[PDB]
Amino acid sequence: LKKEFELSKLQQRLGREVEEKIKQTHRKYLLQEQLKIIKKELGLEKDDK
Amino acid sequence: LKKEFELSKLQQRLGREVEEKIKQTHRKYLLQEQLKIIKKELGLEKDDK
Numbered sequence: 001l002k003k004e005f006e007l008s009k010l011q012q013r014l015g016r017e018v019e020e021k022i023k024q025t026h027r028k029y030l031l032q033e034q035l036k037i038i039k040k041e042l043g044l045e046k047d048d049k
Numbered sequence: 050l051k052k053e054f055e056l057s058k059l060q061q062r063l064g065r066e067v068e069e070k071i072k073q074t075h076r077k078y079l080l081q082e083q084l085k086i087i088k089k090e091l092g093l094e095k096d097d098k
Contacts, residue, residue, distance in 0.1 A: 006079065007086060 003082070007082065010083070
């Protein structure tokens with residue numbers, strides 16, 4: 001049972017790590033996106049056709 | 050309660066001793082188990098190019 005248990009707990013740590021890395025990715029993306037919107041927000045032209 | 054706790058304690062300590070002697074099993078065995086997880090997790094390969 002413990003032989004199974006060691007792998008399971010390892011997998012649990014690995015799973016939280018991969019998922020938290022995805023969260024640290026996207027949460028920081030929300031922060032950078034907020035940064036952009038504040039850098040843009042000021043009334044300015046939109047380069048387009 | 051003293052006698053019962055001593056019984057549970059002697060069993061837990063003898064078992065802890067068994068647990069240390071199993072911990073004497075080298076970490077290479079654990080990493081070998083993980084290597085077996087690499088070789089006994091998936092089968093088919095699915096989409097030969």
